[PDB]
From a paper:
In this study, we investigated a donor who developed a family of potent HIV bnAbs with different lengths of an insertion in a critical framework region following infection with two founder viruses that were closely related and underwent extensive recombination. The bnAb lineage is defined by a CDRH3 length of 22 amino acids (aa), an IGHV4–34*01/IGHJ6*02 heavy chain (HC) and an IGKV3–20*01/IGKJ2*01 light chain (LC) gene. A greatly reduced ability for donor plasma to neutralize N332A Env-mutated pseudoviruses of different clades identified the V3-glycan bnAb site as the major target for PC39 neutralization breadth. Ab crystal structures show an extended CDRH1 that can help stabilize the CDRH3.
Author numbering:
A (entry chain H): 1 to 31, 31A, 31B, 31C, 31D, 32 to 82, 82A, 82B, ...
B (entry chain L): 2 to 27, 27A, 28 to 95, 95A, 96 to 214
């Protein structure tokens, strides 16, 4: 049962040094047939998989050339732990960083191993967010319904959960009593490094004068709880 | 070595045959082609290694085929748990390793045109020196949608961000949220803020707009 557990600080300022650690369980650094390949693969928000670096059974290291020399991968053989260090982090380096086990047969007298030339075991990953912001509760602004947000008999309204850090926030409507037609979107990483998402709900236009609408926002990293009444704008 | 996957999105139902393509810029040996499955909120899962060998626990329906430049992940017939993103990878004799952009297999349904809504910046946000304008596309299918921000006489670029929900569990539709963010000083320079939406379900691009200051 090969297992990879990851830890390390995922919240860093600009230009700081990322430091992640991966502990190997169920397997040796080299493997039984000197075929183990220990890789770091990241996935920026919304994009695909980007390879970063590798250390093999011989402790040879090969890195992604696009990262220049900012990446260093080492191993503590006494602990069976691999470390990833990325220097001078940018907002572009914000991603989920996976510790991955690969395999490539190297001994000619050996049988072809399972998952040869394949990343068969992946760690759960460590989310990394580069930003200059500290832990900040969001500002909950109303997305007020009006004659510019009505399709047929249906009005749309919501809340903008803006300028918080880090992830995540939770949004509910009327203390969870309103769920039908609700859409809470995944946050986007602003240029400033803060986060921002929108939670909306479609309702009958006539209910704007007979039903109150409140978005319940909860940002546990900052212990910020905001209840925002969203009222229709008349004009 | 660049891997290009196609199509960008595959809309199928259970029982249909999925054929995902992976094309390399150069000729690669089958031993170096891997395929992965990834679902939202989960690490990727190895499906095929060395071009055609199924990884441990991969069901029979997942098969691989091809040689030279064209390789394929073929699901005989989709099961309900096969809707995910699939990546192909070049796992060569030495790094670097490159992945394709991916192919998303979603649930097929009838075309649903989005409902478009536009939200002005709230007075609370303007008092802090920032103006966010939100455009909402509600419960549409397929996922392909074009959202263009126009402020007065200028199409906007580099000042908005998009966010799409997963395919709904009830009606299998998508929803999108686009946020145009401007400084308060720039926001008050213009009047007409418009959101143009192109989708397969709309006979023509639907534009939702408002006039700043006006009503
Ligand atoms: C960035 O630096 C400031 C000042 O040192 C600090 O308050 C803030 O928490 C830092 N941000 C992160 C994400 O560590």
């Amino acid at each position: 049962q090969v297992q990879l557990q990851q830890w390390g600080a995922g919240l860093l300022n600009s230009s700081e040094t990322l430091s992640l650690t991966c502990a190997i369980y169920g397997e040796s650094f080299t493997g039984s047939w000197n075929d183990q390949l220990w890789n770091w693969i990241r996935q920026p928000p919304g994009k695909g998989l980007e390879w970063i670096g590798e250390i093999d059974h011989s402790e040879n290291r090969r890195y992604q050339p696009s990262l220049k020399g900012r990446v260093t991968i080492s191993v503590d053989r006494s602990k069976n732990q691999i470390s990833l260090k990325m220097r001078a982090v940018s907002v572009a380096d914000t991603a989920v960083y996976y510790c991955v086990r690969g395999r490539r047969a190297t001994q000619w007298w050996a049988v072809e191993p399972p998952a040869n030339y394949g990343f068969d075991v992946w760690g759960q990953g460590t989310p990394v967010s580069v930003s200059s912001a500290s832990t900040k509760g969001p500002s909950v602004f109303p997305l007020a319904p009006s004659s510019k947000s009505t399709s047929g008999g249906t009005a749309a309204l919501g809340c903008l959960v803006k300028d918080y850090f880090p992830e995540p926030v939770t949004v509910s409507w009327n203390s969870g009593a309103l769920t039908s037609g609700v859409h809470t979107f995944p946050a986007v990483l602003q240029s400033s490094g803060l986060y921002s998402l929108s939670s909306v709900v479609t309702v009958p236009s006539s209910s704007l004068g007979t039903q109150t609408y409140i978005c319940n926002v909860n940002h546990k990293p900052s212990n910020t709880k905001v209840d925002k009444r969203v009222e229709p704008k008349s004009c | 070595i660049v891997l290009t996957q196609s199509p960008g999105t595959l809309s199928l139902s259970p029982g249909d045959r999925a054929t995902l393509s992976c094309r390399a810029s150069q000729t690669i040996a089958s031993t170096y082609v891997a395929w992965y499955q990834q679902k939202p909120g989960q690490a990727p899962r190895l499906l095929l290694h060395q071009g055609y060998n199924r990884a441990t626990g991969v069901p029979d329906r997942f098969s691989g085929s091809g040689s030279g430049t064209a390789y394929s992940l073929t699901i005989s017939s989709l099961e309900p748990d096969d809707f995910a993103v699939y990546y192909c990878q070049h796992f060569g004799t030495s790094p670097p390793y490159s992945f394709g952009q991916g192919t998303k297999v979603d649930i097929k349904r009838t075309v649903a045109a989005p409902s478009v809504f536009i939200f002005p910046p709230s007075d609370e946000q303007l008092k802090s020196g920032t103006a966010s304008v939100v455009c909402l596309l509600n419960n549409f299918y397929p996922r392909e949608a074009k959202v263009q921000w126009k402020v007065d006489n200028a199409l906007q670029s580099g000042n908005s961000q998009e966010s799409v929900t997963e395919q709904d569990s009830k009606d299998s539709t998508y929803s999108l949220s686009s946020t145009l963010t401007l400084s308060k000083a720039d926001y008050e320079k213009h009047k007409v803020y418009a959101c143009e939406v192109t989708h397969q379900g709309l006979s023509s691009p639907v534009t939702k707009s408002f006039n700043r200051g006006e009503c």
